[PDB]
Amino acid sequence: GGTKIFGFWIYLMSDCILFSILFATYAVLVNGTAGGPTGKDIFELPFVLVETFLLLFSSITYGMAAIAMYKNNKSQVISWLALTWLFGAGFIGMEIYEFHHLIVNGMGPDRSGFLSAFFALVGTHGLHVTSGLIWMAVLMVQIARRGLTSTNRTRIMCLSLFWHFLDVVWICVFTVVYLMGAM
Template sequence: MTDAIPAYDAAVDAPKHHHPVYDYDSGPPVDRGKFAIWVFLGTEIMFFTGLIGTYIVLRAGSPSWPNPAARLAVDITAFNTFVLICSSATVVAGLFAIQNDDRRKFNLWWGLSILFGAFFVGVQVYEYWHLFAHDMTPNQDLFWSTFYVMTGFHGAHVIIGVIWLAAVYVAALRGKYSSKDFVGLELAGLYWHFVDLVWVLLFTLVYLM
């Protein structure tokens, strides 16, 4: 007598995969996170292009435009630009440190980056507070409207960047990143450098030209 054929059991006999299983990676030959952040940064480039393009149209079409040096504290903002560039440099130094598994240097450089970023936001808040105290509000004229829109949106990006840098810093302190896995830090760094890059342009357009 032969053994009875067991009944079909879905839990055992059903196929384990509902899609083809390849023995190679079907994704692009680049880290998915890095690909995604660059797509995102592409949209950010378009966003700031729209703001800057509108600024150029409004400025070039205006009968007059005040000299920014007469209205804004260029020296303070120039120092703030120094600070933002320093923060970009410390982010790169921190990334290089984690790539060499030097956690002590990483903690120092990345912590400094967060402090520099927070300092930049603090100076911008001080600048806004000072301007508002002297009735230099966005509804005064086109100069102030464009000034607050461009620096305001950039400031929001800086705040998001500081939060992002701090979040990955906490994760790094818990031992998440190493010389074998540092993409999370790299993505936060790319966003931060983009914010720095935009400020280099905005500082020239809004404060110096």
């Protein structure tokens, strides 16, 4: 029951340590630019603002899904979960768009240490969001097949913890790398 939720919280703490290590690497290598981008010329902060709005909307829609899960309503839980998945997919495709724009130009992860650290931190958060999206798709399928059963309510709570934790990590990312990058 709640043991799975507590264990997933402890794993989210382990991932907090993982992201802290990636943040330390980014903070070390932020000035490790080697004749290339200095961050202020690539971050394009309107992109970051719309992305942060998208991920916050995803978190809010998942919260609505959770409060609708407390009520016994299968349909609206699936609807809010689909909306959350759409927001997260937009987030991921927008970060794949940004990473593609960096990669096609000479400003890839192999260009400099700063770009490698930026790619590590932001693409690791992106891979966490993508894994959360795969988990959300599987959870939507399982909820549709079996309903809001005890196993699926626990999974709903665990993925809620995961998604809000990812949103918090993105708060720290856009604050640390994107905003401080552009002074």
